[PDB]
């Protein structure tokens, strides 16, 4: 039902800025959606952008979002669905991945989401990923990973 934050850790400035691939979450949502790709550009210490992800019934769908900032959470709105809305506490950042909890209708128990900056990431990275996980109260072993996209560093 919770995670155990850094003590502050709170953020940085156009951090989350450009292009993110959402592969791992725990809980898995990948039997949902799948290929979430998502571009931000930084208004200030806000955030726009959009996400694409493809559903099993229906295609290529994008949505507009906004990320409202604040201290070490941040609110995220889809112009959509408005289902994956929630205060998000950010659990680690990093140059080529960054990692969310938070608790959207879709998950209220809780919803962990590590984005990538790149599709399939090397080894490297998801050791830190792993270690960042345990620093904050999870594990790799309850993390569903996005096999609609192959990586065998996700496997
Ligand atoms: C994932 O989206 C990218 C967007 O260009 C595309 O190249 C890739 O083939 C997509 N695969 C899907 C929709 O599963
Ligand atoms: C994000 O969108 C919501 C939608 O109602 C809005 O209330 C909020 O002020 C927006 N923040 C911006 C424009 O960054
Ligand atoms: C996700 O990938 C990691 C390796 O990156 C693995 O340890 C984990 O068990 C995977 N989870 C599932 C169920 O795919
Ligand atoms: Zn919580
Ligand atoms: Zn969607
Ligand atoms: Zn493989």
Redesign the pocket.
């Given at each position: 039902k919770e995670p155990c934050p850094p003590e502050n850790l709170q953020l940085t400035p156009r951090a989350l800025v450009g292009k993110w691939y959402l592969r791992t979450t725990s809980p898995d949502i990948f039997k949902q959606v799948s290929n979430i790709t998502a571009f931000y550009s930084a208004?200030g210490n806000?955030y726009?952008g959009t996400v694409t992800d493809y559903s099993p019934e229906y295609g290529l769908e994008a949505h507009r979002v906004?990320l409202?900032v604040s201290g070490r959470t941040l609110?995220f709105?889809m112009?959509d669905t408005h289902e994956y809305d929630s205060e998000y506490e950010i659990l680690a950042v990093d140059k080529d991945y960054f990692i969310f909890y938070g608790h959207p209708p879709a998950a209220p128990s809780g919803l962990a989401l590590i984005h990538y900056r790149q599709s399939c990431p090397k080894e490297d990275i998801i050791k830190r990923v792993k270690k960042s996980l345990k620093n904050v109260c999870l594990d790799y072993k309850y993390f569903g990973n996005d096999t609609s996209v192959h990586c065998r560093y996700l496997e």
């Open positions: 208004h806000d726009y906004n409202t609110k709105y112009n």
